[PDB]
């Protein structure tokens with residue numbers, strides 16, 4: 135009646151939890167796989183039959199030639215990067231993707247100078263406070279800021295009267311040079327490429343509202359929504375201001391695709407068995423030591439977009455439970471359990487104490503978070519190779535206890551356990 | 565189990581549909597009445613027992629001394645205006661409101677210079693294109709733009725180390741003067757007030773996430789959510805760029821209060837019997853004539869915030885059906901039906917034609933919208949006084965047909981019919 139309900143895959147920590155993996159797995163029989171917020175600052179790794187892919191703007195289901203990939207109005211798109219990405223995956227075998235890629239005509243555009251201002255703002259904050267955000271420098275913040283200001287431009291603007299567009303492009307370019315006089319912008323040059331992309335994107339563009347709506351009310355379809363970033367990186371709920379500039383939480387699905395809450399079915403939270411954070415900001419369970427090195431190393435924890443080394447720490451339940459209050463997860467996907475195969479003991483943060491007393495809830499003030507003392511619980515390691523596990527029974531005793539521990543302390547059920555990078559390295563628990 | 569489901573009241577056109585009225589009516593037995601997006605740019609009129617109120621930041625349920633009013637993290641707050649408003653309503657009888665007003669510690673702050681830059685940006689766009697946005701000049705756009713940029717400041721920042729806050733305040737102040745050198749900012753002066761407000765707001769501040777979450781999972785409660793602005797004014801879905809800078813659509817409820825889609829129950833769309841738009845932008849059914857004057861006049865259509873005269877036009881189903889695709893309304897509230905009591909004929913826009921051919925869906929490109937030819941349907945007036953109506957039976961034949969016409973063409977049911985400004989001037993149809 136009201137229509138089909140989409141399935142959502144969201145990050146529950148600070149990203150890189152394995153969203154590409156979970157989405158790839160669920161997109162096998164999906165009719166539509168979509169992306170709702172963020173840009174190519176996102177980096178999702180998919181592994182199927184040896185071949186490894188790293189998607190940024192392309193929905194991770196772009197591999198499925200039977201499914202339709204959709205980029206929603208909440209996404210911010212840098213045209214050059216978009217094709218740079220598609221062509222790189224073409225070389226990996228991706229063919230006729232422009233045949234199954236639809237782009238919402240309301241999605242905003244990330245311009246060359248946006249990524250430029252992004253870098254400049256980072257160097258300015260660093261060379262003025264010794265500390266900056268840790269941005270991926272993909273111009274995400276500047277573009278979302280132009281959007282809220284209503285000065286930004288969108289897909290439909292590029293595909294319309296080009297002369298009109300150009301007049302706006304120039305005004306926006308200037309507006310930036312104003313706040314950053316040391317910014318160089320080849321107005322006429324960048325516009326030449328944008329005119330070229332216009333005709334390259336044209337055939338794929340569609341009205342997103344009508345598109346999603348038609349799909350959710352026509353003959354039942356299986357629609358999958360790929361989140362980007364994660365709960366604690368959410369512009370509203372994350373460790374502000376050390377967050378990304380979009381809503382990575384479940385609400386972002388509605389505002390980013392134009393679908394009402396009743397068309398939202400299962401909302402899966404991707405939970406990494408340990409915590410990682412790439413960029414600046416508070417991180418309670420962070421491990422700057424041998425154990426931190428072993429997680430970073432055994433987990434190959436480096437940017438799939440920037441190449442930066444990620445910070446690593448024990449699992450942290452304070453952020454997870456917080457993420458659950460905002461997203462209302464219906465089941466979890468616990469990834470990279472195998473990374474813990476070697477440990478004799480695995481610590482997990484259960485609460486935060488301040489001045490001796492335990493704090494009641496996750497702090498809105500990030501600076502506070504930088505001073506909390508994490509209260510840990512120590513669990514026994516299983517000291518066994520789980521990379522070959524395929525069913526609940528395979529996992530040794532301690533591994534199973536660790537899975538329950540996450541379950542119980544979150545009140546949410548674990549539906550999948552990740553034991554490898556490839557699609558097959560999964561254990562559906564129900 | 566998952567918890568209670570909140571009731572949402574949203575605008576289906578370009579605002580001023582009567583949201584304050586519908587919310588006041590529903591808040592009588594509400595445990596919590598909240599506000600999720602926008603700022604005091606919003607203007608909601610409530611009428612109960614002669615006394616008339618116009619709320620801007622205060623949830624319209626702030627009148628109910630038994631219910632709790634909540635301002636969510638999606639809201640942008642200008643401290644001065646906040647109290648200017650509360651004190652004005654105190655004079656009208658509002659007492660001990662600070663006792664039942666809770667403010668999310670994650671809500672961003674609108675600073676004096678924001679409202680200043682807002683005005684300057686408007687004069688600049690006008691004195692450079694002969695056309696500006698039509699902003700209420702309440703600094704909404706500048707504040708949301710600072711938010712996306714992560715340069716903005718929040719409630720929790722004001723309530724924390726003031727010296728720290730001040731350092732940021734100054735950096736943000738400068739950032740603005742940079743793009744607007746003709747901007748005067750009394751850094752030390754504005755900071756003196758902000759320090760005063762800090763202690764004035766302190767007692768009401770709480771953690772919004774924990775707050776809403778606790779309410780939705782504790783003993784069942786009736787939570788009401790007051791939308792601001794409306795669908796066609798939505799930053800993503802409205803007539804961009806002639807929109808407001810927040811998500812007025814249903815998704816805004818989730819991102820603005822931190823609650824997952826499953827805790828969203830009824831979503832009511834407030835539909836005015838004719839269409840009004842205050843500000844610049846395309847408006848297909850606009851009536852610049854005698855009929856336009858009669859609606860503006862009989863409907864007292866002037867800004868409840870600015871005092872500006874609103875533009876008026878016939879009901880427009882293209883925007884309404886579009887609004888429904890994004891919000892997924894469960895029932896409608898058709899307001900100001902009485903305004904039509906005098907007309908011998910009432911026209912309604914059913915579709916948009918371009919170059920002779922009918923367009924398939926509401927256009928993402930606003931400029932197109934400025935050239936569409938509206939296709940009208942003419943209905944017979946009832947030529948009778950409905951202001952005294954209180955039940956379906958009271959309404960004359962033509963009035964009832966008009967209510968059905970809205971129903972049928974939208975596929976959504978009309979649950980309330982407004983016949984006056986006061987709470988009692990309502991007809992619940994089911």
Ligand SMILES: O=C(O)C[C@H](Nc1ncnc2c1ncn2[C@@H]1O[C@H](COP(=O)(O)O)[C@@H](O)[C@H]1O)C(=O)O
Nearest residue numbers: 149175176177269270377378412413437438439440
């Ligand atoms: O390092 C990379 O390659 C990042 C890439 N994608 C992301 N993964 C993890 N965190 C991410 C991502 N994108 C944004 N962020 C974090 O958001 C913060 C703001 O940066 P931005 O979004 O560029 O404005 C900032 O703290 C970012 O680190 C990945 O797959 O690893």
Ligand SMILES: O=C(O)C[C@H](Nc1ncnc2c1ncn2[C@@H]1O[C@H](COP(=O)(O)O)[C@@H](O)[C@H]1O)C(=O)O
Nearest residue numbers: 579605606607699700807808842843867868869870
């Ligand atoms: O005129 C008034 O008093 C407005 C007041 N509240 C609103 N009612 C109707 N439209 C509104 C409101 N707030 C914002 N807008 C429209 O949003 C557009 C952008 O302006 P802004 O939100 O100030 O950035 C711009 O087109 C605005 O007209 C009211 O109750 O009438």
Ligand SMILES: Nc1nc2c(ncn2[C@@H]2O[C@H](COP(=O)(O)OP(=O)(O)O)[C@@H](O)[C@H]2O)c(=O)[nH]1
Nearest residue numbers: 150151152153154177178179470552553554555
């Ligand atoms: N060993 C192992 N690696 C995994 C597992 N799940 C995911 N990974 C890898 O962990 C990395 C996570 O980074 P990323 O792709 O950015 O995650 P996303 O941003 O959430 O999609 C990828 O290289 C994945 O292939 C798992 O269960 N085991």
Ligand SMILES: Nc1nc2c(ncn2[C@@H]2O[C@H](COP(=O)(O)OP(=O)(O)O)[C@@H](O)[C@H]2O)c(=O)[nH]1
Nearest residue numbers: 580581582583584607608609900982983984985
């Ligand atoms: N005559 C009449 N006036 C109404 C009715 N419903 C609302 N109004 C008035 O119409 C105006 C709508 O403006 P506004 O309060 O900004 O609506 P909101 O922003 O949606 O809350 C207010 O002055 C209301 O009192 C109705 O059914 N009849």
Ligand SMILES: [Mg+2]
Nearest residue numbers: 150177178438
């Ligand atoms: Mg990643």
Ligand SMILES: [Mg+2]
Nearest residue numbers: 580607608868
């Ligand atoms: Mg109003």
